[PDB]
Scaffold this motif. Structure first.
Motif, PDB file in Angstrom:
ATOM      1  N   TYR A   1       0.845  -1.185   0.000  1.00 36.48           N
ATOM      2  CA  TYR A   1       0.000   0.000   0.000  1.00 36.48           C
ATOM      3  C   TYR A   1       0.883   1.238   0.000  1.00 36.48           C
ATOM      4  CZ  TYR A   1      -3.329  -3.482   1.633  1.00 36.48           C
ATOM      5  OH  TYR A   1      -4.111  -4.625   1.759  1.00 36.48           O
ATOM      6  N   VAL A   2       0.314   2.370  -0.380  1.00 38.90           N
ATOM      7  CA  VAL A   2       1.095   3.591  -0.183  1.00 38.90           C
ATOM      8  C   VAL A   2       1.386   3.778   1.300  1.00 38.90           C
ATOM      9  CG1 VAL A   2       0.168   4.708  -2.235  1.00 38.90           C
ATOM     10  CG2 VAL A   2      -0.930   5.138  -0.045  1.00 38.90           C
TER      11      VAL A   2
ATOM     12  N   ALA B   1       1.711   6.579   2.882  1.00 39.89           N
ATOM     13  CA  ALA B   1       1.113   7.807   3.369  1.00 39.89           C
ATOM     14  C   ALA B   1       2.023   8.418   4.421  1.00 39.89           C
ATOM     15  CB  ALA B   1      -0.336   7.609   3.815  1.00 39.89           C
TER      16      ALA B   1
ATOM     17  N   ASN C   1       5.224  13.824  -3.830  1.00 42.75           N
ATOM     18  CA  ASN C   1       3.975  13.126  -3.525  1.00 42.75           C
ATOM     19  C   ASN C   1       4.040  11.614  -3.691  1.00 42.75           C
ATOM     20  OD1 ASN C   1       3.774  12.663  -6.221  1.00 42.75           O
ATOM     21  ND2 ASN C   1       1.696  13.474  -6.475  1.00 42.75           N
TER      22      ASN C   1
ATOM     23  N   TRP D   1       4.807   9.193  -1.816  1.00 39.79           N
ATOM     24  CA  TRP D   1       4.372   8.416  -0.682  1.00 39.79           C
ATOM     25  C   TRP D   1       2.882   8.522  -0.461  1.00 39.79           C
ATOM     26  CZ3 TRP D   1       7.071  13.007  -0.394  1.00 39.79           C
ATOM     27  CH2 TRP D   1       6.494  14.050   0.337  1.00 39.79           C
ATOM     28  N   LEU D   2       2.223   9.418  -1.186  1.00 41.34           N
ATOM     29  CA  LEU D   2       0.810   9.716  -1.038  1.00 41.34           C
ATOM     30  C   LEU D   2      -0.035   9.010  -2.085  1.00 41.34           C
ATOM     31  CD1 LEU D   2       1.125  13.535  -0.506  1.00 41.34           C
ATOM     32  CD2 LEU D   2       0.635  11.796   1.224  1.00 41.34           C
ATOM     33  N   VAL D   3       0.448   8.959  -3.324  1.00 36.69           N
ATOM     34  CA  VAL D   3      -0.307   8.417  -4.445  1.00 36.69           C
ATOM     35  C   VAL D   3       0.434   7.312  -5.168  1.00 36.69           C
ATOM     36  CG1 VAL D   3      -1.589  10.563  -4.741  1.00 36.69           C
ATOM     37  CG2 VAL D   3       0.484  10.160  -6.076  1.00 36.69           C
TER      38      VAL D   3
ATOM     39  N   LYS E   1       5.225   1.919  -2.532  1.00 34.28           N
ATOM     40  CA  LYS E   1       4.295   1.111  -1.754  1.00 34.28           C
ATOM     41  C   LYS E   1       5.105   0.193  -0.841  1.00 34.28           C
ATOM     42  CE  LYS E   1       0.273   1.369  -4.745  1.00 34.28           C
ATOM     43  NZ  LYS E   1      -0.897   0.641  -5.325  1.00 34.28           N
TER      44      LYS E   1
ATOM     45  N   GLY F   1      -3.877   7.257   3.816  1.00 31.42           N
ATOM     46  CA  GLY F   1      -3.827   7.556   2.398  1.00 31.42           C
ATOM     47  C   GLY F   1      -5.218   7.907   1.930  1.00 31.42           C
TER      48      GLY F   1
ATOM     49  N   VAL G   1      -5.842   7.758  -2.373  1.00 30.12           N
ATOM     50  CA  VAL G   1      -5.955   6.488  -3.070  1.00 30.12           C
ATOM     51  C   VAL G   1      -7.317   5.885  -2.739  1.00 30.12           C
ATOM     52  CG1 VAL G   1      -3.467   6.072  -3.194  1.00 30.12           C
ATOM     53  CG2 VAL G   1      -4.766   5.238  -1.213  1.00 30.12           C
TER      54      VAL G   1
ATOM     55  N   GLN H   1      -9.120   3.898   0.628  1.00 27.18           N
ATOM     56  CA  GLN H   1      -8.187   4.579   1.508  1.00 27.18           C
ATOM     57  C   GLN H   1      -7.542   3.577   2.451  1.00 27.18           C
ATOM     58  OE1 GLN H   1     -10.200   7.815   3.534  1.00 27.18           O
ATOM     59  NE2 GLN H   1     -10.854   8.764   1.630  1.00 27.18           N
TER      60      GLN H   1
END
Ligand SMILES: [Cl-]
Ligand SMILES: [Cl-]
Ligand code: NA
Length: 233
Positions: A39-40, A42, A127, A129-131, A135, A183, A186, A189
């Motif tokens: 997953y990201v 975030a 960005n 780590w956000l989108v 991962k 996150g 994405v 979430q």
């Protein structure tokens, strides 16, 4: 016993999640396949962003990151603040400014040296780590947390201890260090709470949950704490 209890905390929240506990790894919850899914990160990435930035002299621990007045996603972030403040508030724009200072080349080198997640930061320095494309699985997060707890990351001891100060979240007598993540950009979430308990043993943990639309942030802390208590803290 413990397995059934922790699974029930996730079931009663009507979502899917896992919590990893760590040299042996154990996994609990109602969707353990999430342990093996990336997953990201975030805002959990702020831990590593801060380590990289301090180590490479892109900021100090006393520096104030000024708000230039442009509106941000949360009014709580529309203020001047230090890296430690921004850690506690998960103030994305402060850490985006830090990431820009580090720059893409140094960021990518450090992420690969640490071995964080899939290690792919892509081409957009502020960005990833956000989108995505960066991962990380929950087991990878728990291994990062365990290394951090033991000062085994490839940074100076002092750099690691400086960032820990920003993450110490509970003291009772033992200590809990942790970093939340959410996150929101994405779909679905993802919610995170990654950290460790210092009792002198260190026990690392990483909660990873699907954050249904409208769920409170506190569910991450609630399930984590109940899980650790069930396991005997
Ligand atoms: Cl101080
Ligand atoms: Cl963007
Ligand atoms: Na960050």
């Amino acid at each position: 016993q413990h397995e059934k209890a922790i699974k029930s905390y996730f079931d009663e929240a009507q979502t899917q999640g896992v919590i990893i506990i760590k040299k042996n790894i154990s996994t609990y919850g109602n969707n353990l396949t999430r342990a093996h899914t990336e997953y990201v990160p975030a805002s959990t990435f702020k831990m590593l962003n801060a380590l990289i930035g301090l180590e490479n002299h892109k900021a100090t621990t006393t520096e104030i990151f000024k708000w230039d007045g442009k509106k941000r996603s949360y009014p709580m972030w529309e203020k001047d603040m230090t890296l430690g403040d921004a850690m506690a508030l998960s103030a994305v724009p402060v850490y985006q400014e830090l990431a820009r200072r580090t720059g893409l080349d140094l960021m990518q080198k450090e992420v690969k040296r640490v071995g964080f997640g899939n290690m792919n930061i892509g081409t957009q320095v502020d960005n990833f780590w956000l989108v995505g494309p960066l991962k990380i699985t929950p087991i990878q997060e728990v291994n990062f947390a365990d290394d951090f707890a033991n000062n085994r990351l490839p940074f100076k001891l002092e750099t690691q201890e400086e960032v820990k100060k920003m993450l110490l979240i509970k003291e009772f007598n033992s200590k809990i260090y942790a970093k939340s993540g959410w996150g929101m950009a994405v779909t679905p979430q993802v919610g995170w709470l990654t950290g460790w308990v210092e009792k002198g043993e260190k026990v690392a943990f990483s909660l990873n949950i699907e954050m249904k639309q409208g769920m409170p942030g506190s569910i991450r802390n609630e399930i984590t704490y109940k899980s650790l208590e069930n396991l005997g803290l």
